[PDB]
Amino acid sequence: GDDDEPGGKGAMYEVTIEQSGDFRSFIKSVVVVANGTQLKDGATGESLASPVILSDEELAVEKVTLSTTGKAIEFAVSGGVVDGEDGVVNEPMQWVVTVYKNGKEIEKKSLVFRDGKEISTDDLNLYYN
């Protein structure tokens, strides 16, 4: 389509994020970096000009999946949250997070976030190539 350009190696990748517990009151933060290809948005399947950051409003859904339009050479997946909603008490939350390739799973995770206060935790710190 249009033209192609053979030469070299790499993969494809797809990350998921399910969002459990009280995630709707927790100002949360993610990165996505794609070597050698563009990203795709799980909401709609629109292509995206990576590298990109997801802010809390975008991460207000129950689940995201983001993937690669083509021959990717990397994934990098970091994130965390705070507790700074002017001191509202709620219940804690979780992030059930997984990473897939051009046709296999490679990472199979969860994390648990809880109340207290604002902090800085690279609580998710994943990467692949």
CB neighbours (10 Å) of residue 25?
Answer: 13
Output the CA–CA distances (angstroms, integers) from residue 42 to 3, 14, 109, in the order listed: 26, 10, 19
| C-beta of residue 66 within 8 angstroms of C-beta of residue 100 | no
Nearest to 101 by CA among 24, 11, 7: 11
Determine the 3-state secondary structure of 74 from DSSP. Answer: coil
Q: What domains does the chain contain, in order, with CATH numbers?
A: 1-129 (2.60.60.50)
Output the CA–CA distances (angstroms, integers) from residue 124 to 10, 48, 53, 58, in the order listed: 24, 22, 14, 18
CA–CA separation, 69 and 14 (whole Å): 10
| C-beta of residue 32 within 8 angstroms of C-beta of residue 10 | no
